[PDB]
């Protein structure tokens, strides 16, 4: 049971914290940390892959993309990401076509991309448009507002509505997808989740105390955030959507939509 999840976004949007909050364990460190010298010396995006085993039983690759949007010149920022995703499809196709095929092919294809938007209230930057227009066509892209506690509720509403109009303006395919095979109950679940994408997430690996009650979140000179409060942020909806309700559909659509499209394009080239 394999599930490969990629995080894309500039350094310091909370990408590693979110992953660790979703799976309730310290899976990954921040790809760059507080050390600027940890940025790739090549001055391009690099893939950072780690492997994990969770419980029901679940084998996970986490792919981070250090260097994405972090440099002065980001004009090739998405190409190593595109190359990695396509390489996984090419590997699987190679294995499918061999004469003495393996009985069980390992699936390294990227099943989900958490794409982190800055919570700046602005339309999609040039970088985001170029990367999204390519990534949405080869992987299940789930947009996320990083550090969404930047926004008041009013600003959050305005920003999320603006981003959804951007998605329509550019005609991006955004997960989840509706299909005619879906029952009316499944379409309504899709419609209600879609209405809060990009997810307004807050991440934290630390527990804080509020009136003796211990939950995990963030405590400051002025603030106390409960990450598992659906009234404060969408972290709980993202977790249920990724790991419970749409996990299998994320794996299936990777195969019968993205990989089949890739495979057909390869076999006529």
Partner 1 sequence: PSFNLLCVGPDGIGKTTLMKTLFNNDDIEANLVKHKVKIKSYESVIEENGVKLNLNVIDTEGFGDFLNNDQKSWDPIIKEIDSRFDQYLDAENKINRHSINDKRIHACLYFIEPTGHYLKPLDLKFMQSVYEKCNLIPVIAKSDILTDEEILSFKKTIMNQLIQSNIELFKPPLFSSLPYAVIGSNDIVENYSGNQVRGRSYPWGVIEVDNDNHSDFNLLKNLLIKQFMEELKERTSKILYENYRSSKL
Binding site for partner 1 (CB under 8 A): 10-13, 30, 32-36, 39, 70-75, 77, 118, 120-122, 125-127, 130, 147, 149-150, 152-153, 218-226, 231-232
The item of partner 1, ligand GTP, ligand GDP, none sharing an interface with residue 15, based on CB under 5 to 8 Å by kind, is: ligand GDP
Q: Which residues are CB-contacts of 84 (< 8 A; sequence separation ≥ 6)?
A: 47, 63, 110
Task: State yes or no: 187 annotated in a binding site.
Answer: no
Separation in Å, CA 65 to CA 15, 74, 129, 174, 183: 10, 13, 17, 20, 37
# of chain residues touching ligand GTP (CB under 6 A): 3
- Preceding-residue numbers of gaps in the chain (C–N over 2.5 Å): 55
- In the bound complex, what is the minimum distance in angstroms from residue 61's beta carbon to ligand GTP? 34
Both structure tokens of 225: 């955030």
Starting at the edge strand found earlier in the chain, the sheet holding 207-210 runs 207-210, 213-219, 224-226
- Give the SS3 label for residue 58: strand
Binding mask of the shown chain, residues 120 to 159, with x at each position contacting ligand GTP by CB under 6 A:
-x----------------------------x----x----
- In the bound complex, what is the minimum distance in angstroms from residue 60's beta carbon to ligand GDP? 17
- In the bound complex, what is the minimum distance in angstroms from residue 242's beta carbon to partner 1? 23
Task: State yes or no: 32 annotated in a binding site.
Answer: no
Do 219 and 208 touch, CB atoms closer than 8 A? yes
Of 13 and 81, CB closest to ligand GTP: 13
- In the bound complex, what is the minimum distance in angstroms from residue 16's beta carbon to ligand GDP? 3
For the chain, the straight-line distance linking the first and the last C-alpha, in angstroms and rounded, comes to: 32
DSSP state of 237: H
Binding residues for GTP: 9-16, 44, 67, 147-155, 203, 218
Query: What residues line the site for ligand GTP (CB under 6 A)?
Result: 121, 150, 155
């Amino acid at each position: 049971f394999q599930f490969n999840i990629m995080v894309v976004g500039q350094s310091g949007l909370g990408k590693s914290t979110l992953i660790n909050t979703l799976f309730a364990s310290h899976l990954i460190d921040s790809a760059t940390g507080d050390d600027i010298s940890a940025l790739p010396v090549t001055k391009t995006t690099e893939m950072k892959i780690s492997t994990h085993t969770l419980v029901v039983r679940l084998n996970i690759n986490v792919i981070d993309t250090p260097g994405f949007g972090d440099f002065i010149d980001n004009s090739k920022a998405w190409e190593p990401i595109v190359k990695y995703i396509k390489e996984q499809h090419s590997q699987y196709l190679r294995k499918e076509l061999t004469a003495q095929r393996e009985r069980f092919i390992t699936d390294t294809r990227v099943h989900a991309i958490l794409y982190f938007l800055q919570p700046n209230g602005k339309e999609l930057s040039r970088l985001d448009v170029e990367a999204l227009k390519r990534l949405t066509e080869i992987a299940n892209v789930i947009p996320v507002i990083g550090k969404s506690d930047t926004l008041t509720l009013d600003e959050r509403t305005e920003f999320r509505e603006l981003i959804q109009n951007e998605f329509e303006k550019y005609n991006f395919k955004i997960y989840p997808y509706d299909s005619e095979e879906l029952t009316d109950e499944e379409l309504e679940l899709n419609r209600s989740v879609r209405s809060i994408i990009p997810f307004a997430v807050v991440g934290s690996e630390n527990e804080i105390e509020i009136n003796g009650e211990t939950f995990r979140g963030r405590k400051t000179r002025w603030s106390a955030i409960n990450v598992e409060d659906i009234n404060q942020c969408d972290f709980v909806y993202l977790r249920e959507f990724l790991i419970r309700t749409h996990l299998q559909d994320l794996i299936e659509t990777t195969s019968y939509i993205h990989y089949e499209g890739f495979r057909a394009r390869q076999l006529i080239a």
